[PDB]
Amino acid sequence: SPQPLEQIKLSESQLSGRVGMIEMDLASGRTLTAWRADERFPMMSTFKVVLCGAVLARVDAGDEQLERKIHYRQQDLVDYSPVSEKHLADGMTVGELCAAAITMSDNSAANLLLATVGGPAGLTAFLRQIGDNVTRLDRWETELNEALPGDARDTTTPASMAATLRKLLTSQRLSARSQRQLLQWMVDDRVAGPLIRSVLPAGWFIADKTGAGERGARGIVALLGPNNKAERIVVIYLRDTPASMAERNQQIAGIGAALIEHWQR
């Protein structure tokens, strides 16, 4: 593999799209690799990790319980609700909804949670409260995936997303138990976690959330490291590429391969 930066460049040339990337030490926030780190990219389903950080903040403050059962209706459901469509009669707890949103990318679960935190405006206010002045949510599922060229709605930057994830997971803004819960939901991702593990060398830790949108938009927010440790945050977004899903996946995997091959930096 090329050095990570050279692989990122190759991925842009091959995709004919924009890649944005950060590699950050989880414990310290040291930025190791940065490429278009201050440019905007649609979050797509990666926003669901920040969403559940806001939920956990409410739990910590005594304004929410993960146990609280939310009753909902069929008319509430949006496209792609593999878990929530199964519980129209009996409802789902707030914690189950976060598990469905993060681990299954259940869109109706995400909207139900968004309703508990004040909608897109409320989630954006939470981001501002934790010192992220860049990331913004404007719309609900599934419109937030539209990825119109040049449109700032529903975007983050690799640098802001990585800093925000670090804040949520490690900064004691969230309680110890809440930090552990957010981490566990990422460890439990069913959409990409097992596939990623199938191609990682033995000994490498993965936790993640992935996203996809229009016009080739694709992303992953992840924790990765050797010796079975979540050593680094890696955030990679792609946008404005005509490439197949398979090739977008392969290019992201190639960046990961370069990071692994050149880990000591």
- Indicate whether 201 belongs to the interface with ligand MA4 (CB under 6 A): yes
Which residues are known to be catalytic? 45, 143
Stretch that binds ligand MA4, among 6-14, 133-141, 178-186, 193-201 (CB under 6 A): 193-201
Which tokens hold the place of 39?
Answer: 């440019």
- Indicate whether 140 belongs to the interface with ligand 3GE (CB under 6 A): no
Measured on CA atoms in the order 234, 240, 245, 248, is the torsion positive or negative? negative
Nearer to ligand 3GE, 26 or 234 (CB): 234
The nearest distance, CB 107 to ligand 3GE, in angstroms, is 5
Stretch that binds ligand 3GE, among 18-26, 181-189, 205-213, 250-258 (CB under 6 A): 205-213
Residues that bind ligand MA4 (CB under 6 A): 1, 196, 199-201, 220, 222, 224, 234, 236, 252-253, 256-257, 260-261
Residues that bind ligand 3GE (CB under 6 A): 44-45, 79-80, 105, 107, 141-142, 145, 211-213
The binding site for a beta-lactam comprises 48, 105, 141
